[PDB]
Amino acid sequence: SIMAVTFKDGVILGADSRTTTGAYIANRVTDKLTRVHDKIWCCRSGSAADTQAIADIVQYHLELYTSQYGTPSTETAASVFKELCYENKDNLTAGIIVAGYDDKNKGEVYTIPLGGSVHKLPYAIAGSGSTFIYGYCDKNFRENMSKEETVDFIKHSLSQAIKWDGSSGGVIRMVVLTAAGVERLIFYPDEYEQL
């Protein structure tokens, strides 16, 4: 279960922490929120190996971009992800949400499904657990929410995704992207289960 939500001050990335092989939880404290640039992050769903390999190449491409042309746009980061995912669609199982904060464009979310298509959205959900919260998220999402409202929206959303999906579980990790900088949040079962 992964999601990125645009609010007034920026964007927030949310994810669960469960990695599975069949029905065995290989890792219960996985970090599915990964840095491709200082204020461009992504949510990884699908194959662990594929998403790690893609994320590692994109981080390389943006580091080299920065050296030559300065800080890249979130749109540029999404495009590099798309290029890898589309051109290698036959050999990849990767569903990636790209979230970033510019000062010009503010908070932006791009979702890249299996095909390698790109969709710019106010907020995005992906992963096996996302199916159970389509109804909930559509009814509860508003544009230009506060930080506290957006953290609650993600916490409640992933709380439901984790509850109904066997493949989702562990802790809820979040990464807040604003002008202020980069904040990491963690929420433990005892907190989000009783919601």
Binding site: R18, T21, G46, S128
Partner: peptide, 5 residues
């Protein structure tokens, strides 16, 4: 298996 949210 192969690790896979």
């Amino acid at each position: 298996x192969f690790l896979f949210x």
